[model samples]
Target: SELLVNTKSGKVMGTRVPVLSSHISAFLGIPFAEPPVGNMRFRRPEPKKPWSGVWNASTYPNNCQQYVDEQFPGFSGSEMWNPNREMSEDCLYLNIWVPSPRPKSTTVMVWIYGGGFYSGSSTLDVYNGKYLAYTEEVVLVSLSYRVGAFGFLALHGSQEAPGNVGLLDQRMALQWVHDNIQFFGGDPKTVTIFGESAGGASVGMHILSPGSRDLFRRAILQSGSPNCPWASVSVAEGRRRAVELGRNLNCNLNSDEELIHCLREKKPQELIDVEWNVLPFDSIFRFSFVPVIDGEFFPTSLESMLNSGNFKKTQILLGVNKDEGSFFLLYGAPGFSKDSESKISREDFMSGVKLSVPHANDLGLDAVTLQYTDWMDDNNGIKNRDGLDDIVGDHNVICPLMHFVNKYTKFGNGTYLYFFNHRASNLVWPEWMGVIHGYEIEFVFGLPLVKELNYTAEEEALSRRIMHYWATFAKTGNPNEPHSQESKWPLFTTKEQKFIDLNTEPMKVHQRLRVQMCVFWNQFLPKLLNAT
Candidate 1:
């Protein structure tokens, strides 16, 4: 018998299967918005027209068009970045996995994948929610939207190609859940939104966004935030980039009408293959396209918005992996190095780096090289190349998050911080790759048992611990519930700066969460930013 659920769009049929300890009804590829293709391309998502009859949500739909790194495949930390899947523009679909015998009121978790905001989708197998739904007894939802030039390309901020549509698409999905999660036995109010990299920044933006403040109750930001140097782009620069894309596509650069027509006439691959002009200035973390400070979705700069005492007050869980910058080494994108083929050197690392606007020049080379390098030993500064991971990770990902936490928690919101340090057992990688970026996703999704780089007993146990903590946080804002057996995840108060050290030996609260490093970046880096 086909298990069925009633949605506002239509009556949909799903399949129920036995997951870890319970059964979950899998509703795959339910459209939340009208397909953004032909005329709708690059426009704000409109509500999907209601269907007349029963809709079969048994199969996955086409993932939004975006390029995949052929070099790293599974190791790219995108277990779902399949090169073989047929992609298209008609890809505003979302997947839902609801635990069978739906509870009266259960927590809901929505996942947004990380790909620097240019690439990623919910179609990847790694994003399957059955395990989490079965284990946590909470509803899990994953969705896809436009990426690359298709979603973010903006010029003149007109209706032809307004920016932040990708973010708008995400917001629409959240609205859909809040409006219709009741049918799947979920409490719309007790919703938690979480993601990694760009996805993490997206959640952070939502926290600051006036439109999405009431959509979710709690947020888990893993290794990303809007203030992260790479997340936001200057509107003028974004417009220039859009013009450059149009020029390359043989469109009229001066006229918006002509550019739109030319872009529309081009195939998905033509636009997807556009190797955007890499700016050597903003070196390590330069994305071709990103969410601009539009007057609507993003009213103002994140820092200004926060400093003005305007942001969503919600429980927050923010932290980064041990070595979040290792991914840069793995996928050596252009402008990252003079020699993109070779592992980066100290000189290459020093240049093309920006913590904020006034980088490299402001943060003196002597000071930065001294702090990131081995100070006690040879003092050659470049002797220990591995220190580069910590430096890049801290300057770009880690420190910014801590800065946000410091500023955000001051407003009296309950915040819990964590440092993911457990290096999974049995993964062969470069020695410098400590606990790299996106490594935490697998553990959060409960993938230790899988044969790929099979995790050990301790690692699987650690995964369980993290899942429980996340589940608890989704249920209540606190990861430490009274009935739970997990260790106490300390609150990140303004005075007492403590965070959980997520390790294999049960979790432990560590007051010294890279205290010395934080002192340098959190305290020192911003000072340097204003210098010169």
Candidate 2:
């Protein structure tokens, strides 16, 4: 018997299965928008034409060609799609986790993955919602969309594309969830859109997207600098990047048909190798996909958008880590020096960094470092920290989020900020990563029972505690609103400046960086808050 359920022409079926701890039916990949391939490449997403046959949700969708999963099977979440399988231009699909026989109140939590936007499907390993559905009594979902050049490439005059089709695809998926989740035992009125890195940034952007504000109620941003340089492209810059991709493929921008065909036919490896002159400056192009700040899907700027009071009333949990970028960039930097401390120069540090125009990293870093260094100064008035505080993560991923939260909560959005400080002793690399990127995933999925990070009893307990807290938050918009038997989580009001520090001596509230870490990022603020 096929588990397929929804057979409404354009939609994929809801595969029936025992949802985790209960006997509720489950579903997997369901289509949202018509596929963006063939002539539709780089075009705005198209709606499905609708089908009568029950589209099978038994199989997974095929991802874009920019990444070849077969080359590295370990990349996961994607596979070589069989054409005979239910595959088509309409690739938007969402999975649901529900406590079956129909729960009275079902909260929905959406997970968006971060792979610089070029890669990552909704079906990553750590996010298989069965566990959470069984434990939290909420609907867990993960979805997919286009990536790399096909999504963020905004060319000139073709203004038809509007540049952020990936974001558009995300919005479309949310609309699907809101309209249909109730069928799967979810409360249409109570949905929380959350994600880590780019997924988080996309959820952050959705709060501002005119089409998406009414779709979700609360949000959780794990580790992202939403409008951060590395995650988005300026209109002019996007055009330039698109043209460069065209040049690499040997196509004329004037002929849309020819250009589209070439892009569709190009070898996947060649596409991956396309010289990502995406950034006008010089740096290795580790990413090819991202959201474009087209003034449509995104607000004018992250800071202005967060400050302007345009977002809906939302409960938020946004945070970064003590070492958020160690996994992403540590391997690319110079070898870690052992003894003598080396200092970073302002020019060298800021030269190739990615920041939105009129927003320079040098100004941000200097303001931050100066404030912290000055406060910690010796009698000589020229004291310096031992390590490089001027790295890219502080400016690119951490500070922007801090600024957004610090400013937006004033607009009546109940926002909380956290600094994940858990360090994993496990290693595939030499970097002693602190709360390394994506470390929270295993904990969030309750996977510590199998793959122990520390092999110690304390680590095991901490893992359970963290997982429980996350599951509880998914159920209630507020991570602090206690659910089952968890601790009385404190609300992150700016007054106490409290946040859950996920470290060894973990505690509820306190300014972990008032004069030190927090003040460093505060120096770059264009304006500081005055007491109410």
Candidate 3:
């Protein structure tokens, strides 16, 4: 059936699609902001102008300009994460899935995708919200923002090309949801923003941003946080990278205006092609362009914001996978592959640590090696490989997330934490890569419910349980309130330090995840770095 909804900006026509017992009104490709093309290339996104005619919202929108990583190993189904649609500069669009038999005022969940701030699209099949909306009985929304250089390049001191337009695009989409979601059965006051990886980092940034205040009442961050070193960069660093990119593109103009103008004149692909030209390290953790402290969007450093407790006060649910670094090592480490079961040598492990954590001096490096080494199996190749995983996982994702959670629990409201330990049964990746990064997303969106994939009954049940937990949290501040029969998820406090272990084999609540490793990364390592 056809459904027509009038947004604040214009009228949109949506289509109904069947989900098991019922259907949902899927509104795809709704423009939330003006196309970031022409002179708008690097500037903040402007609100989309009003339209006079009824807009068609049946098909997905164009993905933002980004290079597809065809070189990534195909055995892991990594290609499923790439943008499936045609690419364009005019990609500031969003999709909404509203349950056909809607509630008068339902909670809203807005999703931002993650591609390390380089490549991600809302149109990916895994992100389809029909099942989540129909089963959870809430409004589910996903939006596309600029990625890579087009979305993050800053010319320093220039208003024409300020950085973090990707984040601004997200803020603009939230404003659009706030102003118009009521028409589609969503309660703007009960909105929750959630994401994974870089998208999770984006959620963290939004939490720290004053511009994002009142736009979301709750947030769920998975496997990423603002404290992660790669999520953002200093303004000076952003400007330096921009200049380096300009130099690589042969647009090395002296003035900021000339540089920005020259960049704007280049094709979108040209900017994306040279994005990694400025990275000193070969690791994926070292993204060339990401969100910047633009003074307006961020106003200060993330550390200062977290320390001062100056961010938005909202309910938070955040977590990480058990082996988050395996995925990075599979693709990021030189000559590493999914086919290799062989262990890395001791020298290889130490070199990987130095490459991943380049800022660490000899003293800091020795301390890290000592902390991660499995003394019982001391110096064995397999043990060294395991130690490297722990080192990379703790330094890159786990500890940074714990740091954010520690600070938020002290000052924020209704904070909860989780640890994802379940790997998808259908994945072709080696069993050694247990619960790798982003594996939780399929379950979060209930992809297991689709019978074609032939997911085991246990997997389907786990997916349903996770959806309930997520949707229940979106409905009420507490995830345990609606489902009294399920295990109660405890609130994370500085004293108790509790979190749930999300797994297929009887989910359990645990305390102080990776406490020893996190302590070394979050506490001892910082002190060691300073001393060195």
Candidate 4:
């Protein structure tokens, strides 16, 4: 069956996709904005004209131009970045998944997938929204944006290229949803923006960007925050990388027209084959072509923007898992866990990081390293004698989490924190990976295949409960507002602030996680030492 959906411009036919013996009529690759390709590659998205006839709403397009599967092993896909799909110059598509017979006023969950800023897709198996949409009267959506050099190449002569093209693409899709979702049984007014990692950071930025405000009312940022290296230098470094890109691709650096032509002309995968060592995210900034802090489009940093009452009126549900870093160690080489915790043999990693980053020696690296190790060993039940690998991961991720929380809280906005300590049942790694990064997302989105590294029956129930909480927050800005038997959780405030602990027993207003983190983060900071 086909469904007629209306946008402000005109009506379009969307084909139905099967789900639960029911049909979900969808518009899979609807272009929200004109293709940001060629001269348009780095420009802010432009409005697209309504198509004269039916637009195919079936298959998803290629994810952004990103590095292939060989770089960072473990999470390999059939395609390094959605293979078996067309990587096009016209890549501004959004996918819509609504329950059968679409509700008149369904909650809308706009998902932004994660992979830092360089990789992600709306079509990934994990983001499949069949269950989440039908289980809770919500219309789920996802979209693709530019990635890597093409999407974020800041160059000496490309000042005309708007820095955050990816971000602009997101805003455009949201605007499309706001203007056109009602006919498909969605309440555009009740849109809940959600993303992990970069997507999360984007959602956070949208919360703070004036251009992106009013596009969505509620937001869910899982493992996402708006803190990365500062801006101008980020652009300069990316331009420098573009130099090697020129050399690798035989582009002329002196000729702006030729260089742009060559870089743009090279095959997408050819760009991906660039060495991992010189890659942007691999750099000291941990990124090369990331969200820029340009004066006009981005305006200001997320911290400064938030501190100035930029997002105080917005309702936010912020969360991070207990042991976000352990996943890195578990999935990577052997030394992370097998090494000595006391001896500090991983100095190469430290030395590498120090050389790339500024003021590394000022951090009293050894002392800070011990502090991180002790904290991680304690937080995830890693014994004190364990290696510093897990500690490094935890400190990097958690410190950023604290920076965001403290920054948001000081703005006097309503901020709630959740510590997902419910470790999944797993043997390849300890349960003490302890609810590590991306672990809770499966539960929050209610994806069955996403059930922990190993899951128990009780864990499944907990996951369902988490989905319910997420749906609740999406519908009404509060995750613990008694969506079901989840119990009544409190609204977190500055004085006597409280956050719910989503643990084995799952209780409300548990201040231990809230209080301890709040004090430690508010008092101590590492952002100054590392954020450059």
Candidate 5:
């Protein structure tokens, strides 16, 4: 028999998938907010109105409008990440997966997808929560929020086009989950929010934002943090980009009201087509449209907030993958994609560094280059390529993440960290890519449990362990609670700096990941910038 759950909005009918011992009650495309369309193009999402009849939530919903770069025609790696469903402006929805026969009160795990704040959807196949929910016996949820210009296009002082509405969309979805998830057998008090990449950044943003306080009790960030250089832009920069976009689309630049009205009249596709205009100097650091400090959601700068130590004190579990820059290097570097095995020339390496650190003066650039250079293999192009990868990975993700981890740990929260160092057996990318960004997600979501895939026995075992760790963390703040036989995951403190080394034999714990490199980027680099 099918399952029927009554939410605050209305009744929803869901499908039941028979697993080994039990079944999972899967509800897809549940509307948590009104369609952000017509007169509500760029406004904050409104709560979903109650419907009279049972809403059929059997199928996945439309993905928010995003620019899908079809660069690799038949490449599995590229195709795997792109949105597989239809795109629309009316994309404010959520999906839920619950264990059949239901626990009296199960912990809730809410997922937010990451696409550089421009593209991502909850409907992606990789984000399937059936196995995780059934195996972990926890209620799983994923949210679909607007992206690209429709979600984040600030008009400076204009009330209509206030920026960071995408984040607001997430906040609204969390409210819905808090209010209505009890009907689905989820315990709202034990809710945990987790995400990867841009989704990870969104998780960190929620922790820092006053608007998202009291929404969730814990956060798990994978390969992202609000401290990442590319995660957000200044209000002035956001406004400038909005004006530039208006000019590009032939909209009036005379006033914020006229600009917003003209922009509202333009089609969604029109805005997406011209939204990404990354300068050569900016490289991966500058995303054209991103969350801005709107005074309301953020209230202050991220640094100031961290310094003030007044944000939400949720239990935090966050980490980055080793060689996080390799994936981006494959796409962002010129001619790197033509031959993955080819070595990067000295000129190309220097040029890449210059582009990545455009603000650095000659002396500062020299110091930067000197620090990354491998002394033993000074002239080898391959080693130089590795150096460049370290630079990009450190500056963009690792150092920023470490900064947040340090601050959060200092605030006396239950903070845990992990370093994903193992690559999947079935990845289409080259062997040297080394466990690039988003690779840990497959294991975290228990994709190996599907059985149709070619996952090895070892891989399957690892996936189970990861799923157990994540779900255990969701249930209790401590990942090693209830005395599991697995390796003891230690707390990351300001002084100790310990982390779990995932995918290793026995999954060992380590300390002080990239100590000197992080110091150079987080402490010394800022001094260099000021001195120059």
Candidate 6:
């Protein structure tokens, strides 16, 4: 099952990994950059030097240096989501799964994982590319980028540790694909970059980046965008974080050289262990060590870039989960306290709305809650929290994505939007978790049919259709190919505001998704912005 292929760098060996329909040549753990360690810790990624002889890419390489967290209860919530075999500074590697060695050049799907920008690795089991390669007939690539303080901590000005090494790491990886993916039977020109949550946001940032202009032609963003508050950080705040870390580590904050050297001297775990005290733990969004306004990569604000046309007219597919906020409630809501039974009181709910809303006193948060939670009658059901979940999802994910789609569609690019509302029956959580964040990943890659988690025939059928849509989109910019399960999913024009509704029953086109709710939150956004 081991196959050898000549790459630009050197001769490399890959092994066959089984997928749903067929096996694929999985070239695991191929370095795309030099190890960012010691003096290189806070700098831009360096090109990986070519290797001699046959390099064994049989096993996954070490994951980018990160904290090992035993606390995160489950997959998406974890500080260490899927434990990596090895961890090191030398983790700027990527995995590629090719359907065949001598096949036609196919579309490339590069996945950027998300963990609030603080955690995630390419080695995660959920990110396995074999299934996608076999099902979609495309070359699938999953890459590792530095997370936590190692990736985004910035010093003052543009000199020492100029933030966003993680984003630059992704950009370098894209360039690697541009130069080398043809050797792996991938069409370098037809690359589609996609990701979830922070990964989705990463894709959006790449779209806005001039450095990433020629690297990708399309983007598939799930539940994230640059418009989201958690996606980027201000320079002043970023510098403060860097200085704070230096102070905590007992290093000389005044000297950037000393700070960089002192940070490099410490182990990766020690750097990750620094507490993020500046985070607003009370807020619905919680992200630390995110991308910053680095002069080179993030030269301007995303909105400014979008306005000044600092972007290519790339085809885009973006959407958000139905109840994206359900995940955040686990963390503290604005003013709510979690009880022993993991439930919030009505008073806490009202207080949370007040704290979360900018014109809380004027808006009468309690009255607004009643309107959103109209179903909160004498039924006394747990579903009563659905109203609060609505607020959370709209404020954090859904509304932001809608606004971004509206803006991007104005460029006359083939931009499509979808609303994922399919929640699996066998999810570890309750049914009320209505299409919670990241729930669509398994379906997107058609993973349910291959893996266990007991998907019903109807669900599997749904999975096939979704996969077909994604694969079809990858092959052609149009997702509504008649050959594969026909459904003319309408494009999200600024006037029509159409989107696909991906549900367990059947996928169909919709004129709007949570129209009233999005309108309410979109109007409320400015006040919240002013307050922030």
User: Which tens-of-lDDT digit does each residue in 1-532 have in candidate 2?
Assistant: 3244453344455554543234544566667777676667667776656777776665455544444335324432123111213323345666666565556567887777666777666565566676666666778777776677767767545644557887888787777788777666678788888787777778778877767889987888877756665777677777777767878778767764556567667655566677454456534324555676777776576657766877766788778777665453332333322222323234323332332122434555355444434344322211222223324456557766766666666775566667777664443333444456666665666545444334456666666666556666656656654444545556666566567677556465655333344344445344331111
Model 5 regions more than 4 Å off: 18-22, 278-282
Kindly report which residue stretches of model 4 are placed more than 4 angstroms away from their true locations once superposed: 18-23, 71-86, 156-159, 229-234, 247-250, 255-258, 275-285, 329-334, 337-359, 373-390, 410-413, 426-434, 449-455, 481-486, 512-532
In candidate 3, stretches whose alpha carbon ends up further than 4 angstroms from where it belongs are 73-76, 282-284
Weakest ten-residue segment in model 2 by summed lDDT: 378-387
TM-score of each: 0.91, 0.80, 0.97, 0.84, 0.97, 0.91
Q: State residue 8's C-alpha deviation in candidate 3, in Å.
A: 1.1
Off by over 4 Å in 6: 72-80, 333-343, 354-384, 482-485, 527-532
Better of 5 and 6 by TM-score: 5
Please give, for residues 1-532, the per-residue lDDT of candidate 4 as tens digits: 4376766756666767766456666677778888766766556678788776666666776556665455334533223234336556577788888777768888898998776676667777667776677666689888778776656665544555546777888888898889888877889989988888778788878877778888998887777677643222355665666677777776688865667677666776777676344554322335556676665555665557766776636678877776665554433433344223322234444543343333345554554444445443343323531334444333445556556766676664467677777765642344434555676766765555343335677776777777777888888777765436547767766665577778658585665343443443334444434453
**Evaluation by TM-score, superior candidate among 2 and 4:** 4
Model 4 TM-score (2 dp) = 0.84
RMSD of each: 3.2, 6.0, 1.5, 4.5, 1.6, 3.2
The TM-score obtained by model 1 is 0.91
Local error of candidate 3 at residue 61 (angstroms): 0.3
lDDT of 6 by residue, 454-501 (tens): 788878887877777777787788777866556678888878888888
**Which residue ranges in model 2 land beyond 4 Å of their true spot?**
1-4, 7-25, 68-91, 101-105, 156-160, 254-268, 284-289, 336-390, 425-427, 449-457, 481-486, 504-506, 512-532
Q: Is candidate 4 or candidate 5 better by TM-score?
A: 5
Q: What is the lDDT of candidate 2?
A: 0.60
> Candidate 5, 450: how far from true, in Å?
2.7
